[PDB]
Symmetry: D2
Amino acid sequence: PYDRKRQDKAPVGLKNVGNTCWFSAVIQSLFNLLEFRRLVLNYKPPEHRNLPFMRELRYLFALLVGTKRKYVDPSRAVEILKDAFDVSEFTHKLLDWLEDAFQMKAEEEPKNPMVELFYGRFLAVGVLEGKKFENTEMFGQYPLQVNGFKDLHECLEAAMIEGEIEKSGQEHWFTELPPVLTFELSRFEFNQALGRPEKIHNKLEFPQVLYLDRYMHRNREITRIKREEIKRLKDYLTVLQQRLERYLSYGSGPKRFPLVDVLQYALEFASSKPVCTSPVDDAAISSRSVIHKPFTQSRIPPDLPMHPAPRHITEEELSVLESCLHRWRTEIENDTRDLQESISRIHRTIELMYSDKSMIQVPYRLHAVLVHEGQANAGHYWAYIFDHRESRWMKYNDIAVTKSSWEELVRDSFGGYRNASAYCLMYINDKAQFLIQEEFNKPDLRDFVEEDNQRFEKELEEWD
Amino acid sequence: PYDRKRQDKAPVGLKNVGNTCWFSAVIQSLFNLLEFRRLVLNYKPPEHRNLPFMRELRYLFALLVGTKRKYVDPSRAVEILKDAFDVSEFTHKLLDWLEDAFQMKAEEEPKNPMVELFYGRFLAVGVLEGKKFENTEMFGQYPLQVNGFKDLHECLEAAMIEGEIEKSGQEHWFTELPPVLTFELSRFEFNQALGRPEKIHNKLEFPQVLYLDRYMHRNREITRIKREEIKRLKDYLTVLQQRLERYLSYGSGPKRFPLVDVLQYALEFASSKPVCTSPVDDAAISSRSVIHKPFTQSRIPPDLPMHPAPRHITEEELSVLESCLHRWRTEIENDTRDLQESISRIHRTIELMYSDKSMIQVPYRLHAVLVHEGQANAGHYWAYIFDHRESRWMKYNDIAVTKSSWEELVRDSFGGYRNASAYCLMYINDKAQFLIQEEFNKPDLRDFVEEDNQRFEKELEEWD
Amino acid sequence: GPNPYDRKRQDKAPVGLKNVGNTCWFSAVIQSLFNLLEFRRLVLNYKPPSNAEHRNLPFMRELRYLFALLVGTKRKYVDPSRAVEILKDAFKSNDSQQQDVSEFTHKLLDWLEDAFQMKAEPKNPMVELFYGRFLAVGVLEGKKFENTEMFGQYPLQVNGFKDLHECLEAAMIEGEIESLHSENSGKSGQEHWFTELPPVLTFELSRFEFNQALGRPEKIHNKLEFPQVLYLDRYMHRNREITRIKREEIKRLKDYLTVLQQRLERYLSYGSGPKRFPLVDVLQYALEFASSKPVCTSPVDDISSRSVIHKPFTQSRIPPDLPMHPAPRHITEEELSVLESCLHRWRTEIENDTRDLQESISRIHRTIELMYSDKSMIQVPYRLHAVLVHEGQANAGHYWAYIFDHRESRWMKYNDIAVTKSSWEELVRDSFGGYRNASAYCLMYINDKAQFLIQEEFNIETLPPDLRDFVEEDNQRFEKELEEWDAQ
Amino acid sequence: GPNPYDRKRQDKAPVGLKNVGNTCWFSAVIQSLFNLLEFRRLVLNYKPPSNAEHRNLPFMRELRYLFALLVGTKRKYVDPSRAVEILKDAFKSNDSQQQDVSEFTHKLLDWLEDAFQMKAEPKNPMVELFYGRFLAVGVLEGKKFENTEMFGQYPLQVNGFKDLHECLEAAMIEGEIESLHSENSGKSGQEHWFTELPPVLTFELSRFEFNQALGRPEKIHNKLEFPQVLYLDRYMHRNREITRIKREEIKRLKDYLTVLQQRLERYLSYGSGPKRFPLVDVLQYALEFASSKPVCTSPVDDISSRSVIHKPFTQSRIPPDLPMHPAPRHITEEELSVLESCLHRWRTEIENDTRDLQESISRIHRTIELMYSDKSMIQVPYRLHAVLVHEGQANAGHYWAYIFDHRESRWMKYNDIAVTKSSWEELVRDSFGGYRNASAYCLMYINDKAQFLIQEEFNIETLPPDLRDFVEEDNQRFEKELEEWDAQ
Ligand SMILES: [Cl-]
Ligand SMILES: [Cl-]
Ligand SMILES: [Cl-]
Ligand SMILES: [Cl-]
Ligand SMILES: [Cl-]
Ligand SMILES: [Cl-]
């Protein structure tokens, strides 16, 4: 334990204090959100054990910006939180206390600067057996179910639509968006074979920049139309995928093979030299090689009749077969190509449905990804957080803070690639330049001489 | 630990004393060989630490026949053996000491009763580049390599033949067989992909009764002939298996399918209703059911043309195809059946090669099977030993001695079925009735009042 | 082919039928009927009404001829062209509904029933053999109903059923039924119970299910077994109360059977990631890793035979025990002792539980299979007489049949011109499904108490039995046909 | 088909060749030669000897006609019947050795070489284009030898080689060679080095290997890549000493590369039993088991929406944490703490080692791929001109070709009557193997320094270039052929 807890111009880690990986992830995520870091740092207090937790969190983020060491011990902050008693219940109370802390600071003087960052509003419009309704709900983290979806947009759309819109239905439309937009990616589904709920492992993609234009209430008439076009296109896309499958998995029996091979090999059989008998009736570097003329074949096998082959065939029989099976093969080959072109064409059309400039004006940039691996009410959490000034992805895994990549993030967060997959996505408004508010140069924390002491106490290294 | 170490008319187990499972297996195997049990029990001594080990082994088998408890602690016997220093080196020294103990007892008065049980003689006859040789070697455990063999006879034959007999060659022939015949089944082979030696997991079968007649020197002229017949038969067997494979894996491309399906499905295609257009041009328990006439179909699908199908066909084209592909399919179907009959016929001929009464007069009955599971110089050993008086297989696994079956033995010893496979087979001569020498009735050990004390000391059970 | 000795009946074998342009379905249905002796006698001893559809009576006559050849012709197979032509002419109309082989089979039977109906002027001897009655008792959102329906062929959906009893039960049950209205309120269910059984009992085995991936209906290829003798006791209305309680007991047992199969699966497919492995191997291999000799370094560095005597129970080719990767970098003696005790005891626990679960599952399975095995549930035996097989596309393919020769106690394969001596083993490969591209579409069972159905007429008579010996004329023709060939 | 507008050449595209009864091999070899401009000029400007095999000179003349149509005919494809008939007549003898398409191709080229040989009376302009020389230096059980062999097509065995360079190197190396006799004693080896390269360089890609399971020779279907430009610098005799040292360096690197691939495999396929799993999962899942809430009992008992606000970073559908099987029966707090510390630290160790191994393997792979990438190893470029593809049975199947149109800088698919504008992407799917049932059997490369080979004659002339305008006569015929059809 000599000269091990020392920095090298890298972000500070956090101690595990048992199984508090969930704490590291949530905290490091918040801390890397500069405006929130400033709100916690420049916090002065004016119900619960909320205010000592806020005060202990100050000492956590102070020694995390003052660094000096490699990792900080979050023991005092975690102990207050643990004394109040799954990890979600813990995360919930944590946020409760922080919101309540900022509420007391505001109430004394109302806008809650923390609630101003994470919470937004959406409009819920629908019908219940013919009777209309319209409500504007406040939301925080928008929760998503990931079973059977290919990406985040597929996911989100399915969540902002309930029933059948026109009969009972409901549509959600964002009215007010939070500058810090968060999504839950719920992978828990009941496994009948296992007889318990388990995490689903299908790959669900998400972009580095998400355009929330289509989900906006103002774009409600436009999106509804684009949506119906995709309904029709997906319908067409199916019929083609069905027909193409009949070409690729041909046959009426239990085993199907491609039709093109069925025809090729059938013709191979017919064109084989007939056999009238039953198959049961029965360091050379010392050689003077000849010159090989171009376009020839040397190891070409002998042409003698062997089984399996027709017993007999007519010249007319062969000529009929040869003309049939060859023309039909070209027909089959051309149709598979034609079907595949059309499928990709429909796919491209769907992909670029919301690509026009009037649907690209609400950009949200991915700031953090919270990953989980393992059993449901167990496992381990780590995070991928973006270092906006350095323009680089970072892997925050208790004590270990390493320079990562988008490629690393995807393997660990999309699912299927590894036993780990993202449980939460944190997006930041690209227009919201105030969430990354670094101190001018035209380190020296808002704190009062605390990190200066823990950097001197650690400077004390004995030498025998 | 109350009333747990108590018997119920079952054999006694042995404590693990660390990782001494190998000791339990080898000992329990010897102990269940009644004549050897008698030799160790009625042992009186007249170089090494061999004689105290023999004396400690007496106290082991005494408390193992006197039972009283569930399992015995082999700590004192194992400690002498361990003080002399892989498990084979340990097993070797163990046997060394026992042989030396019996040698001293004999030498004082020469036949070694232990060496008289396990060791035999075979004749080694051969040629070395034209020059003949003939040696009669003494053997103990005959070691076998199991890579690429289906059963014990395949295994043994490959070991009693080296090179090319008539050039250099060698043949082994048993001259003197030990009443207690043991085989090593070596599964260690260098894995190139892994870069180290590892146990091979192919299934290698062995019988409950093995006839050693063919390997006998007296039957050398006869066996040599039978052997050449099998060479010719296996040769024929190959050519057929090759031709049959051409029927079952038809095609010239990377993906092969059965020829019969290639013809069936090709005809299915031809007989489909032609389509001139391209595939891109585009709780009901309230019903009054009608009577269904016999031999009819209700859910029968509509007969409308669909892709894939010929664009066009001639009535003459179809008639040619229909006659070709149908007759050739029958031809193919009949040939696969013909080939399969012949293959099974050759297989049966090979199976019954050494079945005649003159090759069934040297029976050896399986008495014990020593199983291993896990890493090479690690893992764990247990044994399957036959209880000849009860006529039942028993699983001897440290402390745990359970009534097993042949079915259990096979799953654990043949390989492939489980991660465990037999490393050793102990066979006993069926004519040798003296290896199962039970005391007359027309328990009361040869020992002097020892088990009577450990049965009284254990009777001491406190009750608070 | 053209040579008449090729089409000469080798005596002691049944007569085949020509294909006449995809009429394999006709061969199967006809040969099935023909091999049902009582029906063969009804068609043979048929005389039409005194003073008399314009197609049913000529078809019956043409089929009288067909049947007459099948008994005593000297030829190998026989040409069903004139019988098929009358039947095919009924669909010569372009503005029809849909013309599949079932529509053809239906009309065929229509005409035969109508022919026997006209003769009955009353009992219709055909309708007496094939049709029965079942009772349909149920609820429709609380409201009760009770109907006794006449049936012919009882149609079954093959689905994912393992056998005929599984298949039949699923078809005779729907929801839940009870004595009292409250015990039924806000529920829909239905139960079928046989009241009258036909001596000739037929089942349709429907394998057509819409394939979403392919976008069309396709035959399902799962294996569905059927016995040589079927006991219809449990499906009897009189056995209703006993079957209800046994049905309820199996409900309870299957419930238990699930929970076990679920727990066992958690042992066999352990893990939280996408790839699951058996728990026992997870523990074994974890311990293998811990017990490996530690390696403190990283696995990266870049840029004739005279054999000695072998003592029993030893190992010769045993590999060297030197440290290699992968291994722990370091471990404590106490760490290893904890791991060794944990992972070993837990492995035994896991091994014992998998064995315990598997015993219990088989035990429940045996209990379920012997539910209807007692003496009071084996008094309605129906013996399998015929199996109609199909292979290939829907609306296409080919049909053939497996029919039992009751007198010589042997299964026979009826495939058009070709009538070959088969086996039960052959029948199963071709009819159960999965084994081959072919599977039975229809099963014909005969009441074991209904002897007469397949018994010969007393003297035992098997010689030409009808007065119109047109068969002698046809045999005389073929005999002179053989002569002409040798005399060329 | 019969209509002459069907067989009308749509101008700006090359002319095809009729199939004449399985002569696809002829089309491929001919179209390949024809698209080699200098050779096209040699055949076109051919005049036979003044005073003069009885089959070679008529074949050359018949091929002169064939080539003349291919340049300026108005028809879509052309009938090679008269040229093929002379060639086929040379094998009309029943008592021959063996007649495969290679024997035919060989005779074809024989006759052409012999034709040009007679004209040379000396340089044979054909032999000057296709044949080269390599040096064969080696030992035969210690005894040295040195031969300079003339070669034409250099034959390659595809085996399990990944690309053409792997393929070629394996063919130009055998054992080990050295300067001193002692360093060679009791060894056999051989090295080939190109001394003279032909401007038209051809390779055979032999995929025929005896299949033991099938009991006959069969084409191998592994993917073997080849570049659009090949640098033959390393195989040059002058580059011998540099290549030797680089060859030796790759030997050392491949050695290292193995040890790593072996160790990595032990991590990815961990276990002692028949089924191996990744070590990382073995540790993860073992820890999952240990951390599960213990269960002391056996797993056997026998016989619109108004949503609430969700706080960020929380989980809603999170399942209940209640004890279930499989789990430890019991565990100690100390037992768990030992396991948790072990299995977690070892997992990080395992994860870091797999990453470390994979980095090093890719690093060695990159080093090997850039071995011959420097400026002194890229001065002998050969550009791919043609690819001859085969599909199907050996001694059967069908041949077609991919030939490059150097003036319009585009790949073309020559398949008999059909000459279509292709791509490199098309070529790869059909020639690399594995992608389709077809794979290239021959590669034709042209020296990039040898411009003339595929350059047009200066004025740029592309109009009929030979005095015998029999082509005008044939065009006149076809034009009146079109007229006759419209006038019927
Ligand atoms: Cl469209
Ligand atoms: Cl093609
Ligand atoms: Cl033979
Ligand atoms: Cl068939
Ligand atoms: Cl009969
Ligand atoms: Cl050109």
